Amino acid sequence: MIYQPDENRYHTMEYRRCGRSGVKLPAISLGLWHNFGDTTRVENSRALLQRAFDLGITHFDLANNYGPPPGSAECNFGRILQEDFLPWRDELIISTKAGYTMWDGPYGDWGSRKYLIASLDQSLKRMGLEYVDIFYHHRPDPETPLKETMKALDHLVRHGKALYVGISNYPADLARQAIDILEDLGTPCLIHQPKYSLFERWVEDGLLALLQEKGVGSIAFSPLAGGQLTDRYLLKPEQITADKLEKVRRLNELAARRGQKLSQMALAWVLRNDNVTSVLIGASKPSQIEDAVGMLANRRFSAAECAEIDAILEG
Ligand SMILES: NC(=O)C1=CN([C@@H]2O[C@H](COP(=O)(O)OP(=O)(O)OC[C@H]3O[C@@H](n4cnc5c(N)ncnc54)[C@H](OP(=O)(O)O)[C@@H]3O)[C@@H](O)[C@H]2O)C=CC1
Ligand SMILES: [Cl-]
């Protein structure tokens, strides 16, 4: 059938300003890391994107190597965009990235100007776009001068292939250097995409304070620790360790006292200090997107609740 976005999509969703910029992101964003490749059904991928936009999720996050196979999430997103979302493309924030392994050899990974420009050209072709809203350097490249990588980002914005740029997985010291280089170049860093959840709190050691200084936004990836902070395990160590399973059980009892699912409490917790712009979820079914949006109704934490959480995590 012909897709018609829900007319009340902007009524419930909360939009949050992304650092000091003109961009407001939905409090909940959707990532295409899993369930958008050739190994899942396009019927399901389409249903996820339509349910997300109907609930006011305007930001879809991709990367060149998302699938599997690499590049298939960008192709499938490109097809669904052409078929169902073209009249509303200017209502969407689409992102992509380059920095991890995409193709074989010395120019298909890392941070060279060659890789970033060739990869974004590939990404725009797979997605059928003139530009992405945000282009990221996917991870640090310690062996390439940071200035070359940042100058490639500045070039792609000046020559209209990206509206804004970002960095992902950069530690606080490297994030400072990257932000200052981009500011001097005249293309200020819009955003940082770090891993952040109850089980991964490294950004609280300086990065969030630095981004707030510098007026740079942030979007937490793996906010459910890849699905550990859910109902899923309520087992191989890769799935969950014994100590983490005991923490999940105790965190779920606290979520129950609050009248919400563990997943909802875990997402709410990431935004508790109003110093993270958005939470980037993964989803295999539309009910998981509905669950995430349902977190907005119950995302306040008291001093006592934060102490309760820290005590569970200390065990
Ligand atoms: N910059 C970077 O280096 C990286 C970026 N990313 C980005 O961040 C996004 C988030 O990563 P991801 O770790 O997937 O996201 P989450 O941590 O939100 O976990 C998502 C997965 O957990 C399960 N899940 C989600 N909600 C629920 C729920 N309510 N009940 C039960 N299970 C649930 C689903 O798995 P199932 O199949 O079991 O239902 C889903 O695929 C990615 O989509 C991607 O765009 C991710 C990794 C690397
Ligand atoms: Cl476009």
Ligand 2 centre distance from Cα of residue 309 (Å): 43
In CATH, 15-315 is 2.60.120.10: no
Q: Which of 33, 260, 293 to mutate to test the pocket of ligand 1 (most atoms within 8 A of CB)?
A: 33
Is residue 30 within 8 Å of 57, Cβ to Cβ? Answer: yes
Is residue 231 within 8 Å of 262, Cβ to Cβ? Answer: yes
CA angle 236–237–242, rounded 5-degree value: 105
From atom 27 of ligand 1, which residue's Cα is the shortest distance away?
288
Query: What are the helix and strand counts (H, E) for the chain?
Result: 11, 10
Q: Which of 59, 123, 231, 280 to mutate to test the pocket of ligand 1 (most atoms within 8 A of CB)?
A: 280
CA distances from 173 to 21, 178, 197, 204, 290 (A): 22, 9, 21, 14, 37
Q: Give the single-character DSSP code of 200.
A: B
Element (H, E) at 26: strand 24-26
Q: What is the DSSP string of 227-290?
A: GTSSSTT---TTT--HHHHHHHHHHHHHHHHTTS-HHHHHHHHHTTTS---EEEE--SSHHHHH
Judge if the upstream peptide bond of residue 68 is cis by omega within 30 degrees of 0.
Answer: yes
CA angle 138–270–45, rounded 5-degree value: 60
Q: Which of 191, 276, 281 to mutate to test the pocket of ligand 1 (most atoms within 8 A of CB)?
A: 281
State the sign of the Cα–Cα–Cα–Cα dihedral 293, 43, 120, 69.
positive
From atom 6 of ligand 1, which residue's Cα is the shortest distance away?
221
State the sign of the Cα–Cα–Cα–Cα dihedral 269, 273, 274, 279.
negative
CA distances from 270 to 11, 138, 198 (A): 23, 21, 8
Ligand 2 centre distance from Cα of residue 84 (Å): 15
From atom 43 of ligand 1, which residue's Cα is the shortest distance away?
31
Tokens of 304: 């006592």
Protein residues placing their CB within 5 Å of the ion ligand 2: 129-131
Domain boundaries, the chain: 15-315
Residues at CB less than 6 angstroms from ligand 1: 31-34, 61, 168-169, 193, 221-224, 226-227, 230-232, 263, 280-284, 288, 291
Is residue 16 within 8 Å of 27, Cβ to Cβ? Answer: yes
Nearest to 169 by CA among 102, 221, 108: 221
Ligand nearest to the CA of 78: 2
Count other C-beta atoms under 10 Å from residue 28's C-beta. 25
